[PDB]
Amino acid sequence: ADVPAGVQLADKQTLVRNNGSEVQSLDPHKIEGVPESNVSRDLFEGLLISDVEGHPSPGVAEKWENKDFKVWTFHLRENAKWSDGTPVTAHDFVYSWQRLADPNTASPYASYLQYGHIANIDDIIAGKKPATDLGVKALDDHTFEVTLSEPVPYFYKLLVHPSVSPVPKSAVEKFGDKWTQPANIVTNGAYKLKNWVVNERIVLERNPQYWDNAKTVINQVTYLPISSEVTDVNRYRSGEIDMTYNNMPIELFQKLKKEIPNEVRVDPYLCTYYYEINNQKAPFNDVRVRTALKLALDRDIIVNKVKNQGDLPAYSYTPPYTDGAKLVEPEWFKWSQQKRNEEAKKLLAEAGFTADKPLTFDLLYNTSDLHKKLAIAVASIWKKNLGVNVNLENQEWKTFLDTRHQGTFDVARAGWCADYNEPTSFLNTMLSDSSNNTAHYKSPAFDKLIADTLKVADDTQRSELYAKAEQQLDKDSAIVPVYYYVNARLVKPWVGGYTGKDPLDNIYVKNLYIIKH
């Protein structure tokens, strides 16, 4: 942290943050969500990290170069160490990216190495070549070299993601799936794991071996797993919580803005809220049904009437303010809701649905006050505007993500947040073979447009190709875009260091500090 001259620090430097739910895991190769990444960034540090404003900056790598955007050479600082005092080396990165690639690890983020185009990844994921063929090598203990199969000018932007953080081979090999227990885990970020009580709390304590430990201020941070946004706000206002999770309750937000305006932080966020349709299951494999659902949802009611927290009605998957996004707003978005409704009804009647044999399906969402209220409103809108019946189902976070990967579902509430600020961070997840493709969407046309983006060495052509990729997605109604998020959360006046300038919201508790109060 960089504490400003003149600020008086509190004697006790502890922090309590709500983290939305129980994490899937603390293993960097078994995670895919925001709650998981919030904890991962304090524990495991990759080649680069985001600075306090979100710019990619030195992590374990103090400096790096590229050759033709294809061969990337990372010079690792000599004093990077794990929490047991052993050096962090380029061999750790070799083992770790190989483990991420290995199909036996079954990482949800296995395709992140496809997104970066590391050499031989397709064959490794397919079981054709062993993980040791991956295009990574340690030239020495402090030099990590990555070889890509094509020029990727934005490659380094990907490297702040937790899936490309190192994992300690001896602990993994010795303890298998219990390697992340507090008695066994070893970490190289600013913090170490102290306590982990499922469904109660995760407590981290400063890691004195962290190379940048002298600048760390917070000695202990607790992450809670509270999925009720109302309860989160209540325990923030009671004094227990210093920073809520960034999901705000419909019950209280308007009141909060008038009561504690200075604590209500609202900033740009590169995330999209949408209803994910299971494209491989009838009757959702019919474009008419997916289009009808997409058009009949009334975004103005949901966004400005039922939620009204600053979100913007959405007509695409990639948020339009992503760096490199130059999207074409579809004509249906400018129509009246009435005109959308008639088209939707017309399509469902064409698809064979009637008053007597209506369309009925499940709407799955992760336990939450906010998602439940939005799902109920969506259910009523769809009933009124299209005659469709939905059965709401809630599931805890970890189980919910597993259901979507399983493709045991009809429609699910969903949200994707960028891992790097570039349209492919969104678009690559809709590729036929992507490990993140929970829409189970498979379009050769869509795959071709994205493949073509690294075959040109021109930014305008790439942006035009991303615009057309969004048009293909929309044409197929792969999803139901709902709104582009704002990052809305409460932060106590004494929490210093949170700028709200990072559109990815990649916070590191090593950057925060507690002001005397």
In whole angstroms, what separates CA 371 from the centre of its chain?
17
In the complex, minimum distance from the CB of residue 440 to U ion, in angstroms, rounded to a whole number: 15
Q: Which residues contact 84 (CB under 8 A, 6 or more apart)?
A: 186, 209
Is residue 356 close enough to count as binding U ion by CB under 5 A? no
Is residue 410 close enough to count as binding U ion by CB under 5 A? yes
Distance between CA atoms of residues 164 and 46, nearest Å: 6
Among 123, 267, 323, 342, the residue binding U ion under the rule CB under 5 A is: 323
Name the residue nearer to U ion (CB basis): 138 or 379. 379
Asked if 34 contacts 26 with a C-beta cutoff of 8 angstroms, the reply is: no
Site string for U ion, 124-163 (x = CB under 5 A): -----------------------------x----------
In the complex, minimum distance from the CB of residue 337 to U ion, in angstroms, rounded to a whole number: 27
Name the residue nearer to U ion (CB basis): 51 or 410. 410
Is residue 11 close enough to count as binding U ion by CB under 5 A? yes
Asked if 475 contacts 315 with a C-beta cutoff of 8 angstroms, the reply is: no
Is residue 342 close enough to count as binding U ion by CB under 5 A? no
Asked if 481 contacts 294 with a C-beta cutoff of 8 angstroms, the reply is: yes
State which residue has the least CB distance to U ion: 11
In whole angstroms, what separates CA 48 from the centre of its chain?
17
Stretch that binds U ion, among 135-143, 214-222, 259-267, 406-414 (CB under 5 A): 406-414
- Angle (deg, nearest 10), helices 369-386 and 229-237: 140
Stretch that binds U ion, among 77-85, 120-128, 172-180, 407-415 (CB under 5 A): 407-415
Q: Which residues contact 253 (CB under 8 A, 6 or more apart)?
A: 308, 309, 488
Among 205, 343, 362, 396, the residue binding U ion under the rule CB under 5 A is: 362
List Cα–Cα distances, 176 to 57, 171, 188, 362, in angstroms.
Answer: 32, 7, 19, 37
Question: How many residues of this chain interact with U ion, rule: CB under 5 A?
Answer: 6
Stretch that binds U ion, among 204-212, 341-349, 355-363, 463-471 (CB under 5 A): 355-363
Site string for U ion, 172-211 (x = CB under 5 A): ----------------------------------------
Asked if 236 contacts 244 with a C-beta cutoff of 8 angstroms, the reply is: yes
Distance between CA atoms of residues 385 and 350, nearest Å: 16
Among 369, 474, 502, 505, the residue binding U ion under the rule CB under 5 A is: 369
Stretch that binds U ion, among 3-11, 205-213, 380-388, 469-477 (CB under 5 A): 3-11
> Where in 414-473 is the site for U ion (CB under 5 A)?
none
Name the residue nearer to U ion (CB basis): 362 or 476. 362
Name the residue nearer to U ion (CB basis): 303 or 325. 325
Q: After which residues is the chain broken (C to N over 2.5 A)?
A: none
Asked if 137 contacts 145 with a C-beta cutoff of 8 angstroms, the reply is: yes
Residue 129 burial by CB count (10 A; 0-12/13-18/19+): exposed, middle or buried? Answer: middle
**Quick one: tokens of 333?**
């978005």
- The residue type found at 272 is T
Asked if 363 contacts 392 with a C-beta cutoff of 8 angstroms, the reply is: yes
Site string for U ion, 269-308 (x = CB under 5 A): ----------------------------------------
Report the interface residues with U ion, using CB under 5 A. 11, 153, 323, 362, 369, 410
